[PDB]
Each structure stands twice: as structure tokens, then as C-alpha cells.
Amino acid sequence: QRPERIKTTPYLEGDVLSSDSGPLLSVFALQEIMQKVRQVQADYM
Amino acid sequence: YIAPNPRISSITLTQRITTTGPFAILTGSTPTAQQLNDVRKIYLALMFPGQIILDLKIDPGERMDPAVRMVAGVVGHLLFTAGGRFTNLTQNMARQLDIALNDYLLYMYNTRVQVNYGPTGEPLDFQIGRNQYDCNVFRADFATGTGYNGWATIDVEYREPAPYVHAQRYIRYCGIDSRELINPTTYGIGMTYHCYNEMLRMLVAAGKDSEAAYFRSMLPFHMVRFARINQIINEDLHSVFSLPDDMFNALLPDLIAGAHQNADPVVLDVSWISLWFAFNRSFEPTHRNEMLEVAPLIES
Amino acid sequence: WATIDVEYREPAPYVHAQRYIRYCGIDSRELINPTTYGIGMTYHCYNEML
Amino acid sequence: QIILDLKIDPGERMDPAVRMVAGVVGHLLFTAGGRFTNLTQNMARQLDIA
Amino acid sequence: MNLSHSHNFINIRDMMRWVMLPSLQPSLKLALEEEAWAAANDFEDLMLTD
Amino acid sequence: VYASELSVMKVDMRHLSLMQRRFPDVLIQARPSHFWKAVLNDSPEAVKAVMNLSHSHNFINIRDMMRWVMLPSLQPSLKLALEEEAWAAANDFEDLMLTD
Amino acid sequence: VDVFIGACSEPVYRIYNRLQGYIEAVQLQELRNSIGWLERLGHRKRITYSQEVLTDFRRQDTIWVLALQLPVNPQVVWDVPRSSIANLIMNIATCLPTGE
């Protein structure tokens, strides 16, 4: 429904590799901050 | 995510005689379940410029091809941004890509083109090639962004006043307006920016006349992707929860001085091969968020 | 023979041994590909043996 | 419109018997200079060291 | 045409250059197509009006 | 680690070589090779084992360690900066609770 | 920090006032030198060193303690008397490669 998404050439038409949504990266960004601080607190005094 | 068209790196002429791509090994490869999460750490850092930055994540438990690191220093100098306004990577990863680029420009498998070293011992301090391109410009200098995107490119500009009064800036990655996809400025050939155009005519001068001929064909797929990221940042990621301008403008000159800040950038870390897998994706959006309509009721 | 062997450079990580030994005049800062290194190189002792 | 360039296979490039044969032959078969070319700038350098 | 720009890029600024260039090739189809448009100039001849 | 354990070995042998001159009535028969044995019996075994690769077939004597000890070259770490301070606090032997 | 006034013995406080003088020197100019030297080392020996521990999200309020310092003064290794063979054997066993 947008005039940008019209593809008139076979150049911007590839495969689909993977998907990512709104609330998936928000749980993922929190799970990769606490995992980075739980790692380095278990390796050093 | 959208992989590029497979006919970019291979042309078939008569029956099965095909043109072979230079990175035919790295293109035909599958990301594992761990290196795919690091791709989602790169695109999380591009859509949020100053608040999320990257690092290196060195582990001894794995081993890759030695050529994976050296191509990850060419992709890294034209994907991120360490310009004079913000940064996408720390002051350590900006150093580690430089030694990755220095190892790629001296490992010459064809005939050795000449090279003239300089007085110091810093990486990229030479003058490669017959026409003697000075490769000193690709050292990361955070005061002006000499190597990465935003070299001679204004990347943050201001326009008519936004509905949220605290965040009125417009992010322009590599100087591409979002209107360039609809109402274009140049022809199909002359799409460029300054950092990409110097990574071509140096890599040609370093004797890699077949590698820079591959990055030339992938240039309009590159610039369309940053034109898509310049339509998520300033058109969909515009909320109260975004960073105001007097904090955003003080993120880069505080990172160099190391002073105390109450808007500390969250540092994540990506692998070496995740630099290559981030180059071959696009992230066009499909639908908007399920609660973008009731978002101002939550914020109020 | 008629070739510099030891060369001195910028400050090393260890300040006591900052010499830089180059056997037979090979300024080895590059990553050697074994098939296309020294394809047009020589030195003085080898040229006066041939 | 179609020029050609040498492979980067090791061993065969290190093989000296096939290297000198394909240096004398390439100077009588291709065309590089004058009005057009059939070799790349890199290939014609390797057919002179050969 | 999709043999060439399957891996070359052409945008809207490239099609307007190709269209406005003066070069045609007359046949029986084009000589009637040029006259089909000149008859459908006034849009009352297509039976639609505001 | 190796360069910070030779430093604690030197500082322990510096302040120990004055004990004969300060207390002659106790060390009437203490040659300078006696406190060389008493610092090697508290230093780590591995650091002594590194030194024993040279003077296992080289001879050094008590005149050849005083040249090593009196030479000013140290490597400051957390165990050297506290050992050198501990000897300066135990200067008066009234503070080690022994007196004549 | 929260400073206050308490009581302690005389040669015990001499060590505590020197230990905290060393932790104050780790923060200013010794964590920035040990990290800043390894980057100058792996640039030469091609050893990519990781700074993963200085860069979590609690890096603002964190007191670092480093019991060792990296720019080793190399004269203290070469001051051991007649130690030219153990410096050859320890150089072979630590840094020599292995290949066909």
C-alpha cells in the first residue's frame, strides 16, 4: 500500500532468510545484557 | 531479511561457462544458531545509533578460516559508522578492524604490487599500488571519522519540527534520504558515497581488481538497505522512549574523554563472520507494530 | 655479504630487544603466500653463486 | 568483450615445467595491446615472468 | 531485458532517459499504435468526463 | 610472575644482610651464605627452579649474589609494594617483641 | 567512598595505608597501562587480546584490582647472575612453534 515497496526490476527480489519482529528483539536485548554480566561475575573474584 | 539476487556474482554465457565470484566460499555458507543471533546484534546497533555499540567477543573454543577475518575488515569499514556525530562501535573494535584491513592488503596471492611503509608502526601506514594510494586515511580517528561512513558525509540533519519535542533529529546513514528510493537523484550507475568510493579505488590500486569489481555490483543493494534503515529510525522508531538531542550529541565526545555519563552506551559484541552475514541481508519491513496505535496511550 | 641483516625500528613491546632480524634482505611484514613470494627476488650472495 | 585471467591453484603455479611452456605459448596465441586485448593487466604480467 | 538488469541497477531516472531518446523502428504494430494514441487525445472520446 | 618473585627475593635479602652488624652477640658465627639458605627456604620452588637451569652447570658464589641483590632493578606488584613496606614497619626490633 | 575514623595498631596500619595507596594507583594509571600495553603487543605478535571484562553494563561503579603489572622491566630477568642459558631454554619452551 506504499509506493516505495513497488519493485519494477528483478534486482531487489531475493530469497527470504529469516524474520524478526517487535517483541522478539526486546526480550532478546534484555537476555543478552544480563548474560554478559552473569558471565564475567562468575569468572573473576 | 532479504538475501541479494544470486545473479550478482555469477553470469552464465553459453552453456555452463559461468563467471565465478571471488567470495564463492563465503556466499555459499550457512549461519549456525549462534552466529545468527550476532546478526541480530548488528542490526540492533544500526537502528539505534549512539545507544548500542559493538565489540569483538574473542573465544578460543572455535576456529575459522584465516580468510574470514580479513574480509571482515573490508566489510566493517563500509558498514558501520565512527563519524563525527556518533559511533556504532567501540574504540577497541575500531582498532581491531584496522589490523584486519592491514592483514588483507598485504596478503597478496597474485603478483606483489609495491608498497612504501611510513615512519610509524601503526596499522594502514603505507602507500600501496602503482598510483600510490595513501592508506593512512582508513585509520579510525573518532574526531572526524576518517575511515568509516560519515567521512565527508553529513549524517545527522534537522528538518521541520517533530511531534515529540525532545527528539528532532533525522538520521541519514551515508547521506541517503528515504525519498531517494521513490524520486531518485542520480542514474543507476552513479550511486555512491565518499567512504564506499574510496574503498573501491584503493582496493583496485592494491591489485585486487576482481574483489573491488564485486563490491561495485553490490553497491545499489547496499545503499537501498541503508535507505530502509533511514525509514525505520526516523519514521517508526520515534517515541518518548528515544534519546533526546542534548544527550545524543554528547555521546561521542564523552566516549573519547571517558567521563561519567548517565546515558551509558550498552556494549554488545559480535563475531568475525557475523560481519559478513550482516552484509548480505536487507531487513525490509512487512507490517508495522501491533501496538503502534495505542503507543501514545501507554506513554501518557 | 653486502646485505643488511639487523635493522632497528620503532619501539618494541619489550624495550631491551628492539632489533629486527631480516635474513637475506627480506623485509617480512606481510603475510607470505608461498606460491607468489620471492618470484622476482634475489640477493647478493645468491647472485654471485649463479 | 571477454578477457581471461589465470587461476590461483597452488602447486601447478609452482610446477616449473608447465609454467615455462605456458609462457612461450601465450606469447604466440593471444593479443594484448594495439587495438584491443584478450588478457587482463594481471595475466600478461605473469606470462612474462614465465 | 532482464538478462542485463538482473544484476545491474536501473531506477526511474534510467527509464525516462531510454524513453525520451529519439529512435524508433516502424512496423505495422507501431504505425497503428502511434495513431491509436492520437485518436485518444480528447478524453470525451474514451467516454469519461468530470 | 617470575619478574615479581625475584623482586621479593631481592628485598628480603637486602634488609637481612644488616642483621649481623646490628646484633653481633647473636650472629657471632653467621657467614653471609647463611641467609642465602634462609630466603630460598621461603621463596616459591618454581622460581628457584628457573634459576637452577643456569647455575646447574655454572658456578656462582656468595660474592656473585651480592652483585645481583645490590643492583637497582625492580618490578612493582601488589606483593612487592607490601613486602618492602613490611620491612620498614618491622625496623625497630622492639616491635617484633624481643629485646635484650 | 565512605571515609571514617577508627583505631588500629601502629605497624598494622602502615600496611593498610600502603595497600589502599596501590588500589588508588590501579584506577588512575595502571589499568590504563596494562591494557594499553597488550594492545601494543598483540599488534606485533598477532595475538588478538580481549577486553571483555571492562565492558559490561556495571562498568561505571566497579573498583578494579590488579595484583600484577604488565610492562615488565626486562632488566630484572637479565640481572640473575650467569643466566643466559635459562633465558634460552625458557624462551624455547614458551614461544617456539611446531610444524611439518
Kindly write down the DSSP assignment for every residue of C17-30, as one continuous string: --EEE-GGG----S
List the single residue in B183, B188, B217 with the smallest CB-CB distance to E10: B188
With beta carbons less than 8 A apart as the criterion, state whether B140 and B82 touch: yes
- Which DSSP state fits D4? B
Partners of residue E12 in chain B, C-beta under 8 Å: 183-184
With beta carbons less than 8 A apart as the criterion, state whether F37 and F48 touch: no
Residue D36: helix, strand or coil by DSSP? Answer: strand
**Residue B10 to residues B30, B146, B190, B234, D13, Cα–Cα distance (Å):** 19, 33, 22, 36, 25
CB–CB contact G43 B55 (8 Å): no
Number of CB atoms found within 10 A of residue F55's CB: 17
Strand B266-267 relative to strand B52-53, pairing: parallel
With beta carbons less than 8 A apart as the criterion, state whether B192 and B74 touch: no
Residue C6: helix, strand or coil by DSSP? Answer: strand
**Residue B93 to residues A36, B35, F23, F33, Cα–Cα distance (Å):** 17, 18, 61, 55
Interface residue F85 vs chain G (CB under 8 A): yes
Q: Residue B188: which of E10, G37, F3 has the closest Cα?
A: E10
Resolution in Å equals: 3.7
CB–CB contact B268 A3 (8 Å): no
Q: What's chain G's length in residues?
A: 100
List the single residue in E5, E7, E11 with the smallest CB-CB distance to B184: E11
Q: How far apart are CA B216 and CA B222, in angstroms?
A: 10
Q: Name the amino acid, one letter, at C24.
A: C
With beta carbons less than 8 A apart as the criterion, state whether G46 and A22 touch: no
Q: How far apart are CA G41 and CA C11, in angstroms?
A: 11
- Helices A22-31/B35-46 angle, 10° precision: 110
- Helices F80-89/G10-29 angle, 10° precision: 150
**Residue G1 to residues E7, G16, G62, G90, Cα–Cα distance (Å):** 64, 16, 12, 44
Q: Long-range contacts made by residues B38-43, C-beta under 8 angstroms, separation at least 24? A: B38/B270, B38/B271, B38/B274, B39/B1, B39/B274, B39/B277, B39/B278, B39/B281, B40/A20, B40/A25, B40/A28, B41/A32, B41/B268, B41/B269, B41/B270, B41/B274, B42/B270, B42/B274, B42/B275, B42/B278, B43/A20, B43/B278, B43/B281, B43/B283
C-alpha cell at B71: 574480509
Partners of residue C36 in chain B, C-beta under 8 Å: 108-112
State CA B6 to chain mean position distance.
Answer: 21
Residue F50: helix, strand or coil by DSSP? Answer: helix
CB–CB contact G85 F77 (8 Å): no
Contact residues for B167 (Cβ-Cβ < 8 A; gap 6+): B238, B242, B243, B244, B245, B248
C-alpha cell at F51: 634459576
State CA B209 to chain mean position distance.
Answer: 22
Distance from CA of C46 to the nearest CA of D (A): 19
Burial of B280 (0-12, 13-18, 19+ CB in 10 A): buried
**Residue G97 to residues B29, C22, G38, G65, G91, Cα–Cα distance (Å):** 32, 19, 21, 34, 11
Distance from CA of B139 to the nearest CA of D (A): 29
Q: How far apart are CA C29 and CA G58, in angstroms?
A: 40
C-alpha cell at C42: 634475489
Helix (H) or strand (E) holding D33: strand D32-33
Phi first, then psi, for residue B227 (nearest 5°) are: -75, -20
Number of CB atoms found within 10 A of residue A14's CB: 19
Number of CB atoms found within 10 A of residue F56's CB: 9
Phi first, then psi, for residue F74 (nearest 5°) are: -135, 165
With beta carbons less than 8 A apart as the criterion, state whether B216 and B199 touch: no
List the single residue in G18, G76, G89 with the smallest CB-CB distance to F53: G89
- Helices G10-29/G31-45 angle, 10° precision: 50
Interface residue B123 vs chain G (CB under 8 A): yes
With beta carbons less than 8 A apart as the criterion, state whether B173 and B154 touch: no
List the single residue in B3, B220, B268 with the smallest CB-CB distance to A14: B3
With beta carbons less than 8 A apart as the criterion, state whether F87 and F15 touch: yes
Number of CB atoms found within 10 A of residue B263's CB: 13
C-alpha cell at E45: 472520446
CB contact residues (below 8 A), chain E span 1-30, against chain B: 5-14, 17
Which chain D residue lies closest to B209 (C-alpha atoms)? D42
Chain F: partners with 3+ C-beta pairs within 8 Å: G
Q: Residue C35: which of D13, D20, B207, B103 has the closest Cα?
A: D13
Q: How many CA atoms lie within 13 A of A35 on its CB side?
A: 8
List the single residue in B99, B121, B266 with the smallest CB-CB distance to G57: B266
Q: How far apart are CA F87 and CA F97, in angstroms?
A: 15
C-alpha cell at B99: 589490523
Number of CB atoms found within 10 A of residue G32's CB: 12
With beta carbons less than 8 A apart as the criterion, state whether B133 and B124 touch: no
Q: How far apart are CA D21 and CA B198, in angstroms?
A: 40
C-alpha cell at E8: 545491474
Q: Name the amino acid, one letter, at E29.
A: K
Q: How far apart are CA D3 and CA D31, in angstroms?
A: 10
Q: How far apart are CA D1 and CA B116, in angstroms?
A: 35
Helices marked H in chain F:
2-14, 19-22, 34-40, 45-51, 66-69, 80-89
Burial of B287 (0-12, 13-18, 19+ CB in 10 A): exposed
**Residue E22 to residues B188, D44, E31, Cα–Cα distance (Å):** 21, 42, 16
What's chain B look like in SS3?
Answer: CCCCCCCCCCCECCCCCECCCCCHHHHCCCCCCCHHHHHHHHHHHHCCCCCEEECCCCCCCCCCCHHHHHHCCCCHHHCCECCCCCCCECCCHHHHHHHHHHHHHHCCCCCCCCEEECCCCCCCCEEECCCCEEHHHHCCCCCCCCCCECCCCCCEEECCCCCCCCCCEEECHHHCCHHHCCCCCCCCCCCCCHHHHHHHHHHCCCCCCCCHHHHCCCHHHHHHHHHHHCCCCCCCCCCCCCCCHHHHCCCHHHHHHCCCCCCCCEECCCCCCHHHHHHCCCCCCCCCCCCCCCHHHHHC
Burial of B223 (0-12, 13-18, 19+ CB in 10 A): buried
With beta carbons less than 8 A apart as the criterion, state whether B295 and B163 touch: no
Q: How far apart are CA A25 and CA B92, in angstroms?
A: 26
Q: Name the amino acid, one letter, at B100.
A: A
Q: Residue D11: which of B24, G99, B208, C34 has the closest Cα?
A: C34
Q: How far apart are CA B295 and CA B28, in angstroms?
A: 42
* CB–CB contacts below 8 A, A to B: 51
Q: How far apart are CA B238 and CA A37, in angstroms?
A: 29
Q: How many CA atoms lie within 13 A of B47 on its CB side?
A: 22
With beta carbons less than 8 A apart as the criterion, state whether B25 and B239 touch: no
Angle at G96 between CA F3 and CA G77, to 5 degrees: 15
Strand B115-117 relative to strand B126-128, pairing: antiparallel
Q: How far apart are CA B88 and CA B52, in angstroms?
A: 7
Q: Name the amino acid, one letter, at C40.
A: G
Q: How far apart are CA G58 and CA A39, in angstroms?
A: 13
Residue F26: helix, strand or coil by DSSP? Answer: coil
Q: B54 forms bridges with which residues in the sheet?
A: B89
Place of cell 546484534: B41
With beta carbons less than 8 A apart as the criterion, state whether B103 and B73 touch: yes
Q: Residue B270: which of B25, B44, B23 has the closest Cα?
A: B44
Interface residue B32 vs chain A (CB under 8 A): no
Q: Name the amino acid, one letter, at F8.
A: V
Partners of residue A33 in chain G, C-beta under 8 Å: 57
Q: First and final CA of chain F: distance in angstroms? A: 40
**Residue B11 to residues B24, B279, E16, Cα–Cα distance (Å):** 13, 21, 27
Place of cell 641467609: F35
Q: Name the amino acid, one letter, at C16.
A: H
Q: How far apart are CA B230 and CA B224, in angstroms?
A: 10
Interface residue G78 vs chain C (CB under 8 A): yes
Number of CB atoms found within 10 A of residue G14's CB: 16
C-alpha cell at G2: 565512605
Contact residues for D6 (Cβ-Cβ < 8 A; gap 6+): D13, D42, D43, D46
Q: How many CA atoms lie within 13 A of E27 on its CB side?
A: 3
Method for structure elucidation: cryo-EM
Q: Residue C31: which of B236, B107, F33 has the closest Cα?
A: B107
